[PDB]
Amino acid sequence: KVYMDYNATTPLEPEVIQAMTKAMWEAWGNPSSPYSAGRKAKDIINAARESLAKMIGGKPQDIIFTSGGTESNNLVIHSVVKHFHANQTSGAKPHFITSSVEHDSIRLPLEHLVEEQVAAVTFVPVSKVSGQTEVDDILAAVRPTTRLVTIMLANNETGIVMPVPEISQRIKALNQERVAAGLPPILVHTDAAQALGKQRVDVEDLGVDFLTIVGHKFYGPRIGALYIRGLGEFTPLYPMLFGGGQERNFRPGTENTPMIAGLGKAAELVTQNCEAYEAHMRDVRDYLEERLEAEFGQKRIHLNSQFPGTQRLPNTCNFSIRGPRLQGHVVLAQCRVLMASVGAACHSQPSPVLLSYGVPFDVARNALRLSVGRSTTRAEVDLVVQDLKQAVAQLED
Amino acid sequence: KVYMDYNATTPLEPEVIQAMTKAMWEAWGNPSSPYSAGRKAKDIINAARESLAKMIGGKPQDIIFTSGGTESNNLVIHSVVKHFHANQTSGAKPHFITSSVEHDSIRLPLEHLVEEQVAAVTFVPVSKVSGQTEVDDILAAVRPTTRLVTIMLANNETGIVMPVPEISQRIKALNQERVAAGLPPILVHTDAAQALGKQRVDVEDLGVDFLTIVGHKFYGPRIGALYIRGLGEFTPLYPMLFGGGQERNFRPGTENTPMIAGLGKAAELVTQNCEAYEAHMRDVRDYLEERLEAEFGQKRIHLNSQFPGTQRLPNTCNFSIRGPRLQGHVVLAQCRVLMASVGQPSPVLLSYGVPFDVARNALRLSVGRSTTRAEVDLVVQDLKQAVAQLED
Ligand SMILES: *Cc1c(COP(=O)(O)O)cnc(C)c1O
Ligand SMILES: *Cc1c(COP(=O)(O)O)cnc(C)c1O
């Protein structure tokens, strides 16, 4: 078997498992306590927070632990609404700007708020030419009531990277004018789930006020975190949860020490090795694309992740094989080596996301998402490409 | 060293750790996906759900996994408010009835709703006679706008068990009359965090519509679950989170398979051994109280967890040693064997009518599965020693 669904989830690094397993046995105490077991836990959590900050070029004061990317993403949106309501408690609705290709945990909370008449939202389309939301279109959607721009750093289906530094830069410049006109500053969030561990992620270069971190996309456990620039002092955060004071009351509940241990260790590995991970992923992905074009013919392959001049994740190859019988899911069902997907694991009809990218229906119908990882080898690419060869041959008879 | 703070948290059972580590290595796949590491994951999650159902005498369809007791408790409150808003949009506010001794993850979200003028809340005091919220007072607090009664099944500080079955029964009876007057039915939740694994918890006996489960109170991992009676069909649940369809869209987010594997295994051990666990804790806790009274003298000891007639957890002993110097935190600080807690004196003990002088000397000892009578003897001697040097 060969796994190429790393965008859906990654296995745990053995050092990550070690951190978690040891924490289970040795660090089991309530972190709020002065005994060995609880003091050990507090230390693990403090160290983990430093690691996360280091991974994204931030400070630990700006990181809070969460149950995962879904929570982190929901919390940013929740907080922006609560903040608006608190400013007015002193019927206008807050406005959000986002992209047409966001994860369910950004798109769905925003749809819900529109349905419920709590907020206004602009879903900015991606360019059919660049595959990015144009920064001009984002700036053209601004209203007096706009309070958040949320744009994913990299798309999970295509791998396409969004122009988040430009967005932040242009929003900061706009905000100077807004504040001077009595219009509150617009905050910027990016869902960085798919970028972490695949390319450098640095909050100063990104310029963002919030950033979502998702452990299971970078060989860490199924918990997450949220970066909040100057949490408290510069960026407000209104909690969704109320209880016993943990995470400075931004995210109460007894801390999950083993999960935090794992997340911290997964972050350390990214900090040490990101450049090597990126290099490896790119070599094997590019090699996959070369072998697919040599084996099937350049005329028969649509590279759906390639938009001219647009940066993408090093590990992602979304592509389609031309043929009326070669719908993605049917091709995968005949493969005996390849384990991959046709889109988001959680959506397991063509991908709405690909259609939003302007991929024609005949192509989108045949799309397969292969996403490689740290251990993936060229020999494994060769095995996968032969597997695809036999599967297409099977369906063509 | 001897641990007697199991009400704060438990260590993990060895079996629980193995379920988790096995899932880490072998069941790492996305559960939403189809393939080895991922079918393995979905299998684990399904089996765990059945285990949790079995522990509480319910069905797996009525169980959702959460990140912990705080999320589960907040989710119940949130849902009741949303439901009320949904009903009205086709300035009335929902009303909640709760107790004065709830955990921060029930008390604080309710306080926040009062502060934000989103809901009305009655915090019903506990009687200083029985140490329980009187069911009469709960029913007397009912309003047309009442939508939820939430009363913790056992208190974490004192161990005192609340009359949740009576509460549920009297509310169900009220509801027949309410519905026939065009008044919506009142739902009942119990935070069962402190009862699970210490005494039998059964949703049919309890009569509740919602029930919070907290893994780290019963030798499981730091995640949780929520029971919702006839989830979908009978009891509404409006989610807090939006995302990719997991937990039937009641609680989206990629499932934490290893945590779930551990919670399921912890639940399996409770189902298999709950009675043995109860009997052991009761023996050891009762021996603790005997040995305290023998060593310090009966008149020297206030047993704060003891109200005559009133049921309590088998493992909990909240007590005070009478003495000007013997404030709880100072006594613990001088102990070299006992590891425990005091819970300023506890606001919860004050709410129980414990006089200030006794309250501030209060120590909370809560014993566990492994605690022995020999360990009790060590702890009681350590206490004597500690008291002696604070008395010079
Ligand atoms: C421990 C506990 C909880 C859950 O709190 P978490 O910090 O989220 O584990 C809830 N209620 C009671 C009574 C508890 O003792
Ligand atoms: C995987 C992922 C997430 C995190 O969602 P969870 O299911 O909670 O892990 C968030 N955003 C994107 C773009 C993702 O790919």
Numbering used by the authors:
A (entry chain A): 31 to 120, 133 to 390, 395 to 443
B (entry chain B): 31 to 120, 133 to 385, 395 to 443
Quote the study's own text:
Interestingly, human SCL (hSCL) is unlike several bacterial orthologues specific for Sec and does not accept the sulfur analogue Cys as substrate with any appreciable activity. SCL and CD enzymes are NifS-like proteins that contain a completely conserved active site Cys residue (C388, hSCL numbering) that form an enzyme-bound persulfide (Cys-S-SH) or sulfoselenide (Cys-S-Se−) as product of the reactions with Cys or Sec, respectively. Similar to the non-specific SCL/CD enzymes, hSCL was found to adopt the canonical fold type I structure of PLP enzymes, forming two active sites in the homodimer interface with each monomer contributing residues to both active sites. Structures of hSCL in two different crystal forms were determined: P1 to 1.8 Å, with four monomers per asymmetric unit and P212121 to 2.1 Å resolution, with two monomers per asymmetric unit.
Moreover, in a second crystal form (P1) of hSCL, crystallized at a higher pH of 8.1 and soaked with 10 mM Cys for 2 hours, the electron density of subunit A showed the formation of an adduct, most likely a C388-persulfide, to C388 in the closed conformation. The persulfide adduct was present in subunit A with near full occupancy and also in subunit D, but there at lower occupancy. The formation of a C388-persulfide after 2 hr incubation with 10 mM Cys is also an important clue to the chemical basis for the inherent Sec specificity of the enzyme because it indicates that hSCL is not, at least under these crystallization conditions, absolutely specific for Sec but may perform Cys desulfurization with extensive concentrations of Cys over very long time scales. However, this should have no biological relevance since the reaction rate is insignificant in activity assays. The inherent dynamic property of this segment was also confirmed by the structure in the P1 crystal form where, similar to structures of other Group-I enzymes, it was disordered to different degrees in all four monomers of the asymmetric unit. Residues A 391–394, B 386–394, C 389–393 and D 391–394 are missing from the electron density in this crystal. It appears that the dynamics of this particular protein segment is a common feature among group-I NifS-like proteins. Interestingly, in group-I enzymes, this cysteine (C388 hSCL numbering) appears universally located in a dynamic segment, shown to be able to adopt at least two ordered states in hSCL (this work). In addition, a disordered state was observed in the P1 crystal of hSCL, as previously described also for other group I enzymes.
